[PDB]
Design a binder for these strands. Structure first.
Lengths: 144, 143, 101, 72, 55, 138, 189
RNA sequence: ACGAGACUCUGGCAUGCUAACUAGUUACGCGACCGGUCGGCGUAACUUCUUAGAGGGACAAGUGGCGUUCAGCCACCCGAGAUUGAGCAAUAACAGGUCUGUGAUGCCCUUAGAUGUCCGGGGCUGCACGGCGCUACACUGACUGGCUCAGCGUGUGCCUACCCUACGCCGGCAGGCGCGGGUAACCCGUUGAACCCCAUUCGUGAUGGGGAUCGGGGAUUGCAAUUAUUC
């Protein structure tokens, strides 16, 4: 029996979800974490080894803080202000291909949602599922 | 932790140069096949423990990453950290070993000298092959 | 259909406000609902050019600014009254686009 | 010279972390541990790790002029 | 020569494809906002076109 | 419920939506107690909890100030706390309580609520910045 | 009342000199719960001359212009000066700050001679406001001289900064420059 | 009388905009949860941020001191505001610059690869940080365990093909292909304008304050990239 998402700590929710999935170890160890640049703007990419769960939950929070957000601000919030090379480099592509191939495997686990209209929204059924996940991570690691 | 015997200060592991005073991302980089993102990807693909320290290292650990450096094609990663990538003398990314035979070992530079390649002439000096507009230029190559 | 958008624009804000008041008063005089004058951000066209016609002299520039003020007003009314109000001999310097959505 | 340093945690880094350092009016292990000529940063790291056994979550490091515990 | 040697490659885009719309001058043109004048002609006509010095 | 006092520091975009409940401030999903900067925590938590924890249970406020910068949403949260409390106790308690709570919130802050029109200033031709020129004349 | 937790108090400051009532403003209504609350003293007609000691410490330490960018850092170093001096001394950090700066610092600081002077200085009776403020300036610049660019482990550098500023060790460069200033002050005597 | 000031534009100030589908929303019809996804028809009152988009006032219904008690100046006890930055900028002058901006113009030349078409190559580049924009021998500094972000202004076919680009694939990527949006607060876009605990992680700091730059999936919507948009 959890509580609504409005008074739920979103960062604590995603971190509890990630910690619970790490301690469970139910899925395989992902090895595509840093085989790539992971976008144009990373000299040395993340090395969490739960970048799968952590970044999926970060994309989920990006989804829910405003349902219906255009893709691209995802790397405005998580990504930094790039300083690539001798030349000045601006806002442009990341590493999309490996992200899409990883999403093709993530689909079915109800972690990051792709809809039939394209984009994102509140998704009442999805909202119920995420609230239940938050409720069951309410008794997860940290906050103890 | 330290034990009452010889710490891994100065030893000949792979004829490389490293002294146990600079910390991680610098000690691993001392070997030209380990460091930065390549170290990250190797530590991922091999599923290695994060806690392990290089203060009292074992030769096998560095050797295994070096073997991966020789053959990174299977891993689908850039075979970087090689000056010999897609260059003559290796049918496929091969490892040349030993020192004191640098001219033979790096015959790539001899091939660049015998073809008198300005690109090859760049190596041995610190300067831009392009050569920018007359200004603070030329100073690149100070011995 | 009761969805009509009128776009008002001008460089001079006095004429813009006067014509907006004209449209609002015309709509509200007869029994009719009308939305408030949505006030879109002003567009500041900036152009900087050297004052001199040659190469000699201190580098002094001219910063010509041009302010475009545009508003959008909604209308839920029959098209006849809209057409009557639009042809009311608006004040000069104002560009109007009446759209029947 | 080529001063002898030890790259990882050590007994000296573990040395006198709770014997006489926290039994002084000034509870600051920095300079006193520095007197051992062994890296003080990792001494601080070991002290923080032993302080964060799991009872109270202490993961923040903050700046250099950072507080330490009171255990006198 | 008149139509046999020239006009065999794309060259319709150079600086010679533009000129000031007041004096047919190709130097110091203004492309911004499409008024297509040189510096000095625009400075002359700025008051009339609608550009006023306020900044 | 309308109090019409807001909280606005610098240019941060803020909302103060009032309806009875506990007084909580949500910042990046982090409530008032656990805050985003994680280093200015005491300076914001000191005035309210040392007097009472049920003190904010009067009227709940959606405070979702999408503030970027620590000086932006920090001290904006306390601006919101003081303004909401003062307006609620103004309109809906009585004048004497108005006077005493205004006295305590003014010994909280003498006169620094509202500022003058200023920000980062413009750049002039002939130099790289606002007040700077090209090579020097010694 | 308002205090620091259930273990520390802030009403332990009484000097009673009857001379800090003209520039150090504690008289009527200048009290704050807040160490600093976004002052607008610039826009005022030089209404910034009744400034307390904590804000002097806040605004008189940075070297060059290599700290500005976020006043977050200013307020954080105020908070961590609070806490670190509290840890050093076990009592009110501001009280011991005053105690350890008054017993030392400028007795007759640097001030010129007549209409123009750069050869020597004058042993000048330093006003209590300016003596206290410049002693806090001495501590701040000594903190950015010792804690910064230190060859030792930095978690006791405020202790050694206190030692240099009050006890008089021959470590800080600012303290030996002030020693030369004191040599001039005695040259006046 | 002109100039100065006043004047205009511009800046961390407004609880009226009988105000807004771009921005949340008093009483509808969604709704786990200790009057909310009514910003997912659309609140006819809205408005608080946003529109700095339109209408406003408040340095003297002030105090102390100095000053001829005047003009003024220096500090502050009912108190948002107590020198923002620019524009304009006089009389008289310069043998100052421009006839290579000009359908704004005085005083001119005459006869063959005429300054206008054809010049693969190429003009300052034959150049050593005592002319703009660059290195902090360091907890004030680190690669997202931290961002519900602080933030000028451009963008397509009327002469005229040549604009801004989201999203998939070639992809682990320059560059290429495809349907799509945008005449613009409507699409690029919540513009990737710092990463504050800073989950490779600093002891006497040649060694994160270069890496004195040419090898590598493969290198351009434009004839020419040889000192140059290659990335």
């Amino acid at each position: 029996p959890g509580v609504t998402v409005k008074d739920v700590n979103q960062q604590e929710f995603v971190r509890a979800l990630a910690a619970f999935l790490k301690k469970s170890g139910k899925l395989k160890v992902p090895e595509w974490v840093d085989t790539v640049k992971l976008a144009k703007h990373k000299e040395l990419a993340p090395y969490d080894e739960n970048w799968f769960y952590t970044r999926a939950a970060s994309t989920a929070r990006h989804l829910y803080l405003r349902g219906g957000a255009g893709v691209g601000s995802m790397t405005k919030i998580y990504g930094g202000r790039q300083r690539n090379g001798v030349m000045p480099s601006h806002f442009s592509r990341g590493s999309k291909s490996v992200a899409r191939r990883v999403l093709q495997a993530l689909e079915g686990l109800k972690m990051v949602e792709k809809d039939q209209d394209g984009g994102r929204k509140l998704t009442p059924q999805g909202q119920r599922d995420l609230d239940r996940i938050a409720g069951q991570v309410a008794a997860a690691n940290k906050k103890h | 932790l330290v034990i009452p015997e010889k710490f891994q200060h100065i030893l000949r592991v792979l004829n490389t140069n490293i002294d146990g005073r600079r910390k991680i991302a610098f000690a691993i980089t001392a070997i030209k096949g380990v460091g930065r993102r390549y170290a990250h990807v190797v530590l991922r693909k091999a599923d290695i423990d994060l806690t392990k320290r290089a203060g009292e290292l074992t030769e096998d650990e560095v050797e295994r990453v070096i073997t991966i450096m020789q053959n990174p094609r299977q891993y689908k990663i850039p075979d970087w950290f090689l000056n010999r990538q897609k260059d003559v003398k290796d049918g496929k990314y091969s490892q040349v070993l030993a020192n004191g035979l640098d001219n033979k070992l790096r015959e790539d530079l001899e091939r660049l000298k015998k073809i008198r390649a300005h690109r090859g002439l760049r190596h041995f000096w610190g300067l831009r092959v392009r050569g920018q507009h007359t200004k603070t230029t030329g100073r690149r190559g100070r011995t | 259909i009761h969805r009509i958008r009128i776009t008002l624009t001008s460089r001079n804000v006095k004429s813009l406000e006067k014509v907006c008041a004209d449209l609002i008063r015309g709509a509200k005089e007869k029994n009719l609902k009308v939305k408030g004058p949505v006030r879109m951000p002003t567009k500041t066209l900036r152009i900087t050019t050297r004052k001199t016609p040659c190469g000699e002299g201190s580098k002094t520039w001219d910063r010509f600014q041009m302010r475009i003020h545009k508003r959008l007003i909604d209308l839920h009314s029959p098209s006849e009254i809209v057409k009557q109000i639009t042809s009311i001999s608006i004040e000069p310097g104002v560009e109007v686009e009446v759209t029947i959505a | 010279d080529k001063l002898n340093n030890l790259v990882l945690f050590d007994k000296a880094t573990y040395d006198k972390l709770c014997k006489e350092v926290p039994n002084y009016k000034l509870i600051t292990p920095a300079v006193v541990s520095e007197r051992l000529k062994i890296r003080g940063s990792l001494a601080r790291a070991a002290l923080q790790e032993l302080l964060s056994k799991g009872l109270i979550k202490l993961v923040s490091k903050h700046r250099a002029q950072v507080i330490y515990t009171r255990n006198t | 020569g008149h139509q046999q040697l020239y006009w065999s490659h794309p060259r319709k885009f150079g600086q010679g494809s533009r000129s000031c719309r007041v004096c047919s001058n190709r130097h110091g043109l203004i492309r911004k906002y499409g008024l297509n004048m040189c510096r000095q002609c625009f400075r002359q006509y700025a008051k009339d076109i609608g550009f006023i010095k306020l900044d | 419920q309308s109090v019409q006092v807001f909280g606005r520091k610098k240019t941060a975009t803020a909302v103060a939506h009032c309806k009875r409940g506990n007084g909580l401030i949500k910042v990046n999903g982090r409530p008032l107690e656990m805050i985003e900067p994680r280093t200015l925590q005491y300076k914001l938590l000191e005035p309210v909890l040392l007097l009472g924890k049920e003190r904010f249970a009067g009227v709940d406020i959606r405070v979702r100030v999408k503030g970027g910068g620590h000086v932006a949403q920090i001290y904006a949260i306390r601006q919101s706390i003081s303004k909401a409390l003062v307006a609620y106790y103004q309109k809906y308690v009585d004048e004497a309580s108005k006077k005493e709570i205004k006295d305590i919130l003014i010994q909280y802050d003498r006169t620094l609520l509202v500022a003058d029109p200023r920000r980062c200033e413009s750049k002039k031709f002939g130099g790289p910045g606002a007040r700077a020129r090209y090579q020097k004349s010694y | 009342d308002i205090k620091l937790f259930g273990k520390w108090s802030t009403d332990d400051v009484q000097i009673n000199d009857i001379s800090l009532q003209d520039y150090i403003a504690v008289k009527e209504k200048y009290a704050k719960y807040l160490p600093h609350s976004a002052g607008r003293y610039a826009a005022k007609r030089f209404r910034k001359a009744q400034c307390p000691i904590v804000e002097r410490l806040t605004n008189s330490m940075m070297m060059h212009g290599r700290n500005n960018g976020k006043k977050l850092m200013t307020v954080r170093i105020v908070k961590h000066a609070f806490e670190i001096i509290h840890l050093l001394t076990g009592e009110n950090p501001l009280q011991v700050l005053v105690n350890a700066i008054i017993n030392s610092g400028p007795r007759e600081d640097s001030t010129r001679i007549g209409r123009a002077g750069t050869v020597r200085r004058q042993a000048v009776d330093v006003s209590p406001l300016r003596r206290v403020n410049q002693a806090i300036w001495l501590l701040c610049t000594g903190a950015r001289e010792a804690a910064f660019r230190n060859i030792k482990t930095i978690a006791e550098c405020l202790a050694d900064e206190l030692i240099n500023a009050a006890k008089g060790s021959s470590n800080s460069y600012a303290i030996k420059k002030k020693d030369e200033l004191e040599r001039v002050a005695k040259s006046n005597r």
